[PDB]
């Protein structure tokens, strides 16, 4: 029985999608099927922000951020709890989490 | 048995059989 | 879909004739291989000589010992195991005598819990097993 209408991937109107490697296990997962997270995180953690700011040579330095694109296989994305299993009805909800 | 492995075993059987038959 | 044309009779006929060979009964009854493998050779009954008495164990869900006889047919010399139907009827059969054996009722298929047996004894020594069972006739001397 068909679990998903899109077969768990985002491929329409094409035959082949180039694979990528899961950031955790290095599994070969198609780019459309893979679960992608774009993490924009401060290089300095919030606990260390004040201590780094005081030791700054320049006043008003605004610390840089980290830009890392994360690719996940289904197994590692489920294990890491980035995605969870949902009900048959809530599976269809494509809206990203409001956070 | 997994169907792929059943096919592999059958193919090895056929390889031996064609080895013995000349 | 199927073809619907005034000149499609040959296509329909040939397709039906080719697809009939994918019918189990049709292939069995028209290939002729099941006929040569049939010990009776298309006959309803056959006469054989009792080689020995054998008891075959019933299939797993129920337990019993089925009183059969291994017979050799006279027409072709083939070896046959035939069920002796009623109780005590194995005592009416002696080794090395003629028996009339029929099918078991499923056209070459095993019947009931008896494994690999598709023949049954009808007459022994030219007197029916039912007459011997009911006492209407005695075994000839």
């Amino acid at each position: 029985t068909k679990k998903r209408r899109n077969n768990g991937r985002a491929k329409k109107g094409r035959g082949h999608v180039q694979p990528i490697r899961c950031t955790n296990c290095a599994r070969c997962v198609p780019k459309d099927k893979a679960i992608k997270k774009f993490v924009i995180r401060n290089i300095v953690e919030a606990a260390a922000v004040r201590d780094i700011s005081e030791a700054s040579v320049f006043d008003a330095y605004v610390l840089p951020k980290l830009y890392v694109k994360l690719h996940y296989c289904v197994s590692c994305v489920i294990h890491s709890k980035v995605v969870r299993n949902r009900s048959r009805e809530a599976r269809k909800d494509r809206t990203p989490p409001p956070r | 048995m997994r169907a792929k492995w059943r096919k592999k075993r059958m193919r090895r059987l056929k390889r031996k059989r064609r080895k013995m038959r000349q | 879909g199927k073809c619907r044309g005034l000149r499609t009779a040959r296509k329909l006929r040939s397709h039906r004739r080719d697809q009939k060979w994918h019918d189990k009964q049709y292939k069995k009854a028209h290939l002729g291989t099941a006929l040569k493998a049939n010990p009776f050779g298309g006959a309803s009954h056959a006469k054989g000589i009792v080689l020995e008495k054998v008891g075959v164990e019933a299939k797993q869900p129920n337990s019993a010992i089925r009183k059969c006889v291994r017979v050799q047919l006279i027409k072709n010399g083939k070896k046959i195991t035939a069920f002796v139907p009623n109780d005590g009827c194995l005592n009416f059969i002696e080794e090395n005598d003629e028996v009339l054996v029929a099918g078991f009722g499923r056209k070459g298929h095993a019947v009931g819990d008896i494994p690999g047996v598709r023949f049954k004894v009808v007459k022994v020594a030219n007197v029916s097993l039912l007459a011997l069972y009911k006492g209407k006739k005695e075994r000839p001397r």
């Binding site: - | - | 008891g55 010992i65 109780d87 005590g88 194995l90 005592n91």
Partner: protein, 56 residues
Amino acid sequence: GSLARAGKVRGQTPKVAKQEKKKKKTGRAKRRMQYNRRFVNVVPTFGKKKGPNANS
């Protein structure tokens, strides 16, 4: 696969003779008896649909 036991139960069953009874009618008379018992006799049926061989 021992054949020693064969007809054991038909051998050890007590032999009971058939009782002598009045002969039953045949042909049209048997059918007439059936018809009278099943459609002319209404007394046994009060509407509970009992079988002809109900011994309980």
